[PDB]
Design an enzyme around this catalytic site. Structure first.
Site, PDB file in Angstrom:
ATOM      1  N   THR A   1      25.123  86.037  -2.714  1.00  0.00           N
ATOM      2  CA  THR A   1      26.255  86.390  -2.586  1.00  0.00           C
ATOM      3  C   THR A   1      27.479  85.392  -2.964  1.00  0.00           C
ATOM      4  OG1 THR A   1      25.812  88.430  -1.397  1.00  0.00           O
ATOM      5  CG2 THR A   1      27.984  87.736  -1.215  1.00  0.00           C
ATOM      6  N   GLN A   2      28.095  85.754  -3.983  1.00  0.00           N
ATOM      7  CA  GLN A   2      28.872  84.732  -4.265  1.00  0.00           C
ATOM      8  C   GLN A   2      29.989  85.252  -5.405  1.00  0.00           C
ATOM      9  OE1 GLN A   2      26.279  81.955  -6.129  1.00  0.00           O
ATOM     10  NE2 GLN A   2      25.602  83.433  -7.789  1.00  0.00           N
ATOM     11  N   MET A 107      19.831  88.628  -3.650  1.00  0.00           N
ATOM     12  CA  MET A 107      21.357  89.163  -3.562  1.00  0.00           C
ATOM     13  C   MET A 107      21.946  87.996  -2.960  1.00  0.00           C
ATOM     14  SD  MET A 107      20.967  91.782  -4.896  1.00  0.00           S
ATOM     15  CE  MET A 107      22.855  91.960  -4.698  1.00  0.00           C
ATOM     16  N   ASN A 108      21.591  86.718  -3.331  1.00  0.00           N
ATOM     17  CA  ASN A 108      21.935  85.415  -2.975  1.00  0.00           C
ATOM     18  C   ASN A 108      21.884  84.582  -4.448  1.00  0.00           C
ATOM     19  OD1 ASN A 108      23.164  82.870  -2.667  1.00  0.00           O
ATOM     20  ND2 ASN A 108      22.509  82.851  -0.332  1.00  0.00           N
TER      21      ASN A 108
END
Lengths: 233, 243
Positions: A1-2, A107-108
């Protein structure tokens, strides 16, 4: 997530008959601020391999540090870590691509679009791309982002397809690169005039280049353009 | 019925008397004036009549600078005069605004021409008793002379005069033009064109003019304009030199 924060401009590359060519600017960008021209987005690993990276620099920074480790790791318990047990553009790419997809799939993601410029141990041009989606693809030419839109055409106009490559010298492409560099440096707010370039050759191996400045821009005729329109003076 | 004269409706003859009477109001000001296309330029001269001291005479013109390029002379009452120029004023920038390039002179004429024909056809609308001549040096048409009437009728002119004595200068220039055989006064200095004119205005009017006598203007490339009394005076002086 970024999200992109400290951001590297587009990366462009293509493989020529005897090897590959890749360039990315020396700039890196934070918002509309073009924050660091001290940003090398082209990352050599060994002779056969150089890595273009776009997007998050901290990621890229992080990423790059991970890479030496591989070497130092590939070094460990490996007499031939220099010899055939040296790292391979395929491998590194292959290794990396796993990460992103995971990171994505985690999801990262790692925020970057990345080409691995390589020429294989057998001298085969390794040109293959990986995104922060971890989707990868390989092709005679790989440009990223803004470049991917403008430069790939140029370099696809350089090599329409595979058969073109064995016909494709260094300099012919190399020229178009810097040209595309100018082209990109023409039409991108983010594009930098100063940039760097690398060439892995099946023969000369890595040929890397620094501080390459976009030149050969026509700014002249602009003077001839008055207002946006019917303004005649 | 007999209102047909009071109003604009076809007379038994299909005639419009108010129009015909608007024609009266035209020279009702009794100002004679001219429009001459020079070679380069177009030049317009008119009678500046200063009946009173209490006047600020400077304030007195029927020659009006319509645009950058376009001016116009009015023949008719200054209220109606002051009106159409205003009316004209709009179209230019308007046209320009709309069309990105300035309005050609006749366009304004044709435009303004449309206007009275309306009032001509529009009973409660009265047409205006001014005769208008638009001039410029048109980017396309170069020197240009377009006179319009209270009737919305208009045409291009090799040159023209207008006023009570219009016919006289008309003859004069018609004489001189049938003489000169070219549509325009051939002179590079509008000065000469002016000097030519003021001559032929003095000529046909048989009338010497002071610099306070003349409403004088020059349509030049990209700029219509006029002169002070001094260029006039210069014309008075210059013209006094040819004769």
């Amino acid at each position: 997530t970024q999200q992109p924060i400290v951001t590297g401009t587009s990366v462009i590359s293509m493989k020529y008959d005897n090897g590959v060519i890749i360039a990315a600017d020396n700039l890196g960008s934070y918002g509309s601020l073009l924050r660091f021209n001290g940003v090398e987005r082209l990352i050599p690993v060994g002779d056969n391999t150089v890595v273009g990276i776009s997007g998050d620099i901290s990621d890229m920074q992080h990423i790059e540090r991970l890479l030496k480790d591989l070497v130092t790791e590939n070094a460990y318990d490996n007499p031939l870590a220099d010899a055939e047990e040296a790292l391979e553009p395929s491998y590194i790419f292959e290794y990396l691509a796993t990460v992103m997809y995971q990171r994505r799939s985690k999801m990262n993601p790692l925020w970057n679009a990345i080409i691995v410029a390589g020429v294989q141990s057998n001298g085969d041009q390794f040109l293959r791309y990986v995104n922060l989606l971890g989707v990868t693809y390989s092709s005679p030419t790989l440009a990223t982002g803004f470049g991917a839109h403008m430069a790939n055409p140029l370099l696809r106009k350089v090599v329409d397809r595979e058969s073109d490559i064995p016909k494709t010298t260094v300099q012919v492409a190399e020229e178009a690169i810097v040209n595309a560099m100018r082209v990109l440096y023409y039409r991108d707010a983010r594009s930098s005039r100063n940039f760097s370039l690398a060439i892995i050759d099946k023969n000369t191996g890595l040929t890397f280049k620094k501080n390459l400045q976009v030149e050969n821009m026509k700014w002249d005729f602009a003077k001839d353009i008055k207002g946006y329109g019917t303004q005649k003076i | 019925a007999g209102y047909d004269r009071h109003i604009t409706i076809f007379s038994p003859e299909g005639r419009l008397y108010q129009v015909e009477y608007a024609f009266k109001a035209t020279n009702q000001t009794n100002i004679n004036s001219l429009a001459v296309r020079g070679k380069d330029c177009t030049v317009v001269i008119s009678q500046k009549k200063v009946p009173d001291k209490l006047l600020d005479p400077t304030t007195v013109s029927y020659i009006f600078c319509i645009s950058r390029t376009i001016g116009m002379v009015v023949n008719g009452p200054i209220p109606d005069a002051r009106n159409a120029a205003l009316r004209a004023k709009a179209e230019a920038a308007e046209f320009r605004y709309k069309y990105g390039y300035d309005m050609p002179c006749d366009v304004l004429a044709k435009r303004m021409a449309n206007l009275s024909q309306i009032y001509t056809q529009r009973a409660y609308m009265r047409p205006l008793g001014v005769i208008l001549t638009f001039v410029s040096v048109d980017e396309e048409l170069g020197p240009s002379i377009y006179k319009t009437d209270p009737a919305g009728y208009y045409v291009g002119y090799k040159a023209t005069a207008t006023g009570p004595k219009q016919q006289e200068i008309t003859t004069n220039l018609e004489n001189h033009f049938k003489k000169s055989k070219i549509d325009h006064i051939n002179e590079e200095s509008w000065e000469k064109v002016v000097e030519f004119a003021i001559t032929h205005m003095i000529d046909a009017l048989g009338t010497e003019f002071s610099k306070n006598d003349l409403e004088v203007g020059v349509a030049t490339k990209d700029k219509f304009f006029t002169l002070s009394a001094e260029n006039i005076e210069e014309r008075l002086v210059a013209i006094a030199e040819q004769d």
